[model samples]
Target chain A: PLMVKVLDAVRGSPAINVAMHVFRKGLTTEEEFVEGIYKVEIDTKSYWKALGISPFHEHAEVVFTANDSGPRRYTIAALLSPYSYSTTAVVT
Target chain B: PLMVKVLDAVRGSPAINVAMHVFRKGLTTEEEFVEGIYKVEIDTKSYWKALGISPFHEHAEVVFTANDSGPRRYTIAALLSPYSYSTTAVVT
Candidate 1:
């Protein structure tokens, strides 16, 4: 709810499309790649998403920049959690 | 509520620790990996997780097993959306 409005304010136009993934040795695609590593497709998706956004992992690190450009990027790390939200109305 | 309870019923142990990741060429880690590829760790994680649990991808396919085994794995594809739930009382 809040995020959507905030995102809308930021987006102006075009929907925000986000993507993330894992590590492999050769050529790969999202479809074929994740399938090989994780167990349950459901569990895999949830976990990977959580880990992707996280700044800290025992394994390695991710960087972000927007640091003020389009799509705003920053390699900041922190513990983010799921919060509650609801829909109210849309004004024309 | 229900999934947590259901998961608890099935887990009956340490805890359900689910994990997921993406593809890289070499020398990689979750942190370093996502940073290099995606913009926001949040969107990255969310999209990757969703994709990981899915069997069909325009790029490639992910397979699942337990087809009847532990951790119960199945690459069955379908649209699973979030549902509402509540807690009543803990049975003793």
Candidate 2:
């Protein structure tokens, strides 16, 4: 099991294809945080339904960013239909 | 080629492991947005250079999130070397 410890801090606005760094609130640790690989899934049908549109045609774009005391990283993902999807190169 | 129409809106704070939606200005459109696959590149030398640290002793994590009226999607990516990085499963 992966254990995540969330810290309290002020988050900045997200920019496309830009990596943002995260820091612990009032606390500093020399131990670096590690990330694991993962997959992405999207449900366009439900999204269109929520927008009062037919689920037959729907789509979305997914973006990602992570922040550490070091620098930041960014990732983008897109999905159409309930099954169609794509991903971007990691932003560092 | 992809053209992005950035909407002028108040961006909210970013939360980890969560998918956030993006909305256009007052005007709403039927056309859905799609995402494409891409890669990320980071230069720890420059990052650490700015921070006055050894590039070999740096790391970072990368995350992604995307939003559309129809629905939202998210992805995470990670890398370590000049910097440490990670990506999460797309959040929808």
Candidate 3:
């Protein structure tokens, strides 16, 4: 079984909002897990016009898997704001 | 405000236990985030004798930061088990 959760938090502030997802799978062998980070640059002019606030933010994704055993567990967590980011993990 | 949570799960199982931490800071720049993975090998014989079950596990840590902007947001996620792993991310 695998479950994932995403969260958004205020930049330079202590506010947060979150969402989650859950699923299941089977078994295998040769397990390898991959993880990385990404930055999302915002068009300040357009963003400020649309939301009445100039906001820049960052985002990331973490992936996990078992090459032989088909089923694995994965999770994701995020921070949202004028500049935000997150982390992820998994086990099988 | 900054918050951190740690979770433990059964290898090849769907059971979980978790804990959390939180704190705060101020601002700066030269923003650079460092992230990576580290493997932890377990002594299978000792583990099996203690729990009466033969189990193996793996672990990792991800780090992020803003050199100039001293205040930043950081998150860490972990997958634990007979073999487990996780990732971390941050933004300022």
DockQ winner: 1
Q: Give the lDDT of residue B63 in candidate 2.
A: 33
Task: Please tell me the interface RMSD, in Å, for model 2.
Answer: 27.3
Can you write out model 2's per-residue Cα lDDT over B1-92, one digit (the tens) per residue? 22222222324433223222233331222233323222233322111112212211323332343332322223433322111122234443
lDDT by residue for model 3 over A1-92, one digit each (tens)?
22332322212322222221121221112222232212222111110112111112223232332122223222323322211123333222
Candidate 1 chain B worst ten-residue window by lDDT: B75-84
Best by TM-score: 1
- Quote each prediction's TM-score: 0.14, 0.13, 0.12
Q: What part of the reference interface contacts, as a 0 to 1 fraction, does candidate 3 reproduce?
A: 0.03
**Taking the candidates in order, what DockQ does each have?**
0.05, 0.04, 0.03
All candidates in order of lDDT, best leading: 2, 3, 1
- To one decimal place, how large is model 3's interface RMSD in Å? 26.8
- Which 10 residues in a row give candidate 3 chain A its minimum summed lDDT? A43-52
Shift in Å, residue A47, candidate 3 = 42
Cα lDDT tens digits for candidate 3, B1-92: 22332222213322222222121221112232322222222211111112112112223232322122223332323212211122343332
Those runs of model 3 whose alpha carbons end farther than 4 Å from true positions after fitting are A1-92, B8-31, B39-92
At residue A78, what lDDT does model 2 achieve? 28
Worst lDDT 10-window in candidate 2 chain B? B44-53
Task: Write the number of the candidate with greater DockQ, choosing between 1 and 3.
Answer: 1
